[PDB]
Amino acid sequence: MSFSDQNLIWIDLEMTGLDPEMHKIIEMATIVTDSELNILAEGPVIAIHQPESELAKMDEWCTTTHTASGLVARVRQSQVSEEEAIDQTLAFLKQWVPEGKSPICGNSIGQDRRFLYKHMPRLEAYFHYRYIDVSTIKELTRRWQPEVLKEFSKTGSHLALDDIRESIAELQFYRKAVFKI
């Protein structure tokens, strides 16, 4: 429908920790916006199965966060592997954005990309090499006019789809508050 090489691919992952060589992806969510940040479609929201030995690497922050959100129970019950999650996500993205055109979009999105390189390289390859990191704008705003940041807040639930929706909302806020284009 609104297929376009200008559309943007937004992605958020949840993991068992911060180290791609040690930890695993346990949730993924994608959203496609047009170039003006209008949400066109939401992609698969996938809890990825991991065995207890991998869940057992989680520190207290991860254990308490992902248990209280319900993610751990969804991971334990999930029948979807990383490979099947890649397949579902690519089948979605091919309907909205051509391969290799969209930067990877999100907050501190270089961290997610590291996990994609290690665990989902076929999906990493779908992105253009550039990054649209909303937290770049957050950090520049903090230094140039920090009072702006009091006008926006996040819930931060660490449910991947809700968090990437907050990333888009943050950029929409910056478009009006700190940009003049």
- List the catalytic residues: 129
Closest CB to Na ion among residues 4, 131? 131
**Looking at 10-18, 50-58, 65-73, 95-103, which segment touches Na ion (CB under 5 A)?**
10-18
Strand-by-strand arrangement of the 25-33 sheet: 39-47, 25-33, 8-15, 104-106, 131-133
- The CB-side HSE value for 167 (13 A sphere, CA atoms) comes to 29
Minimum CB–partner distance for residue 121 and Na ion (Å)? 19
166 binds Na ion (CB under 5 A): no
12 binds Na ion (CB under 5 A): yes
Q: How far apart are CA 128 and CA 59, in angstroms?
A: 33
Minimum CB–partner distance for residue 40 and Na ion (Å)? 21
Closest CB to Na ion among residues 12, 82? 12
Q: Binding residues for Na ion, per CB under 5 A?
A: 12
